[PDB]
């Protein structure tokens with residue numbers, strides 16, 4: 001089921017990348033990549049992961 | 051837990067006579083790292099939990 005997602009990005013605009021600068025507990029610039037077909041954001045409690 | 055421990059303690063004593071405090075489906079917003087604290091604490095107060 002993973003590879004069928006490729007249609008998104010032709011019929012739609014998909015998410016590609018998110019960045020921050022001095023936001024919350026993230027001092028300075030910060031970055032994060034995202035794949036075309038479903039990802040995850042995992043980490044222990046109290047880490048800004050929301 | 052502290053409250054229900056106190057309320058069951060007979061006057062003067064601080065070891066409750068009834069012991070079996072239940073719980074259910076408790077940890078759905080916490081990590082395995084922090085949940086380990088509660089399990090140890092609960093038994094510490096003197097209770098005994100299914």
Ligand SMILES: Nc1ncnc2c1ncn2[C@@H]1O[C@H](COP(=O)(O)OP(=O)(O)O)[C@@H](O)[C@H]1O
Nearest residue numbers: 023024025026043044045046047048049050079
């Ligand atoms: N604007 C804020 N106000 C208060 N605490 C904040 C703020 N931004 C980040 N934090 C802190 O960073 C963490 C934010 O929680 P997060 O790690 O995003 O939550 P969860 O663990 O539920 O995903 C907490 O430790 C909180 O104290």
